[PDB]
């Protein structure tokens with residue numbers, strides 16, 4: 001149903017753009033249909049881009065459209081910014097079921113509305129059969145930075161608490177189990193969700209936020225390694241304090257997966273001084289998936305425990321020992 | 336050589352990002368390696384996104400990297416803005432020759448430097464063999480609008496001159512002939528080039544620019560139809576005044592192609608009041624490919640010639656008659 005014609009730039013192209021994309025994204029900035037969108041924005045801005053390649057396109061709790069909006073809304077938010085405007089670049093396979101496209105577009109429209117964001121400008125490329133697997137989406141986000149200094153990977157400092165906003169491993173498990181035709185529990189679905197509202201309240205009401213990051217590819221373990229490395233410190237984490245749903249733990253062990261390295265799509269790590277930790281945690285409890293928000297550890301200077309060097313992540317194990325959480329070695333198209 | 340590992344988000348991923356992308360894009364905004372780039376920008380902004388799917392990746396006069404930078408720099412420029420900052424989202428096929436990637440990355444770095452632009456933030460997804468054809472790139476551009484009112488597709492008005500910045504059909508012909516192993520002449524190559532500097536001088540020194548657009552997919556004929564439609568006017572064009580290189584004309588007729596509908600990648604249309612037309616043309620002559628900048632026609636009100644309705648494009652033919660230039664019906668992955 002998606003003919004090559006829709007990517008040629010002619011009459012059918014313009015029809016798809018007006019009748020589908022504009023209809024769902026509905027705003028007068030996009031409606032302009034010019035070579036660029038005109039934006040009125042305040043000053044220090046945050047900009048992020050991500051392409052989305054998730055297989056399958058549809059899964060419990062989300063889809064590629066939901067990922068395309070939430071993930072980019074989230075990345076902009078990690079710099080302590082208020083996301084305002086997104087662009088979307090579709091890459092589509094000739095022959096694609098058109099209802100797949102409309103469902104994905106509908107998901108994006110809905111997600112953007114819920115996040116208080118508009119899709120202001122776009123692109124649509126249709127490639128011949130076989131040139132791509134159904135559909136990829138790139139989204140780029142632009143937002144207004146809310147604080148100075150703003151959160152940054154290099155700002156974790158000794159004595160900081162490390163907070164998590166909810167359960168680990170859910171998204172990664174659900175796509176990997178979907179892809180093998182397995183449903184472990186009703187309990188197991190993607191956590192794809194927008195975190196801009198929790199971040200705004202953290203940054204403006206709690207304050208002094210050092211680091212925000214979303215544990216997507218590589219999971220909690222490789223975002224903690226990134227932060228430890230950028231901040232030249234060591235992250236100490238308590239295994240029992242990292243929330244992982246029983247059903248996720250059980251699904252992960254059945255598939256030989258580690259929930260600490262599986263991509264999440266509706267979660268953040270928040271690092272900040274100890275005296276603000278309790279207030280931040282109170283806020284995280286009210287954010288998406290916040291039933292399971294928790295203090296999971298702390299930041300320490302090199303040689304403080306120790307022997308762990310700058311950039312290392314050490315987990316105190318449930319058995320009373322330790323495990324070094326190093327970066328991976330995999331798990332394709334989980335987002 | 337491009338292993339799946341480079342898309343997993345682990346140690347090799349971070350190595351590729353630092354050792355290749357950051358090396359070539361070299362700037363302290365990107366160097367931050369955070370979830371978003373921090374940008375200091377003035378006020379009314381222009382934002383555009385485009386994905387690039389050109390096949391083949393390398394061709395006379397450019398490549399996908401050159402297209403990825405120039406095309407997006409150009410689109411931002413069409414709103415009478417100064418492009419400042421780009422993002423890039425790579426989608427890569429497992430197994431890809433790594434020197435292909437480095438050559439493309441090198442091209443992007445070079446193009447961005449020449450345009451006076453920085454690549455500030457990025458993404459890199461690697462998909463399994465067969466999930467995509469080698470490589471796609473999305474780029475998003477952000478720029479500062481230079482004038483109010485700024486150029487817009489809906490601002491062409493009766494009496495306006497229609498100017499072209501150079502020859503038509505070159506890019507489209509070269510990729511289509513490359514793809515069939517044909518070299519028509521040394522004269523025939525992509526025109527992939529950045530137009531931001533010509534646009535800045537047009538907007539600030541000539542002034543009162545009504546419309547700017549780049550005749551990419553669908554070519555000159557379907558951007559004139561877009562503008563005529565958005566402006567609810569009729570574009571009148573003179574066939575003999577539209578520049579098309581002899582070698583391009585000859586290559587197009589040998590392949591059954593129409594140079595007026597073939598994508599260009601280093602060209603713009605400029606529409607503005609008659610009394611500024613000569614000054615604008617003087618500027619266009621000094622811009623990229625400006626040897627062939629020309630007045631090609633004019634904008635007229637409905638019923639002014641006529642009988643052509645709002646949105647129509649009529650070409651006075653070289654033989655002394657007329658041809659309606661309507662939108663297409665194709666030519667895949669020409670960009």
Ligand SMILES: Nc1ncnc2c1ncn2[C@@H]1O[C@H](COP(=O)(O)OP(=O)(O)OP(=O)(O)O)[C@@H](O)[C@H]1O
Nearest residue numbers: 009017021033034035090121122123124385551552
């Ligand atoms: N998937 C989409 N979602 C939202 N808007 C879109 C989408 N695709 C295209 N558009 C909008 O449609 C208009 C035409 O876009 P188009 O991609 O044809 O312009 P262009 O980038 O100048 O041309 P080309 O991609 O052929 O070089 C633009 O205003 C663009 O923002």
Ligand SMILES: Nc1ncnc2c1ncn2[C@@H]1O[C@H](COP(=O)(O)OP(=O)(O)OP(=O)(O)O)[C@@H](O)[C@H]1O
Nearest residue numbers: 050216217344352356368369370425456457458459
């Ligand atoms: N192709 C690229 N060009 C320039 N910078 C890049 C590129 N790929 C990644 N980066 C940069 O590397 C850093 C890490 O990017 P990454 O994509 O891993 O972060 P993320 O988007 O938060 O995670 P994910 O894509 O796994 O959800 C970011 O600062 C990003 O701007």
Ligand SMILES: [Mg+2]
Nearest residue numbers: 123124384385
């Ligand atoms: Mg486009």
Ligand SMILES: [Mg+2]
Nearest residue numbers: 075213214370
């Ligand atoms: Mg992130």
Ligand SMILES: [Mg+2]
Nearest residue numbers: 049050458459
């Ligand atoms: Mg990314």
Ligand SMILES: [Mg+2]
Nearest residue numbers: 035410548549
């Ligand atoms: Mg354009």
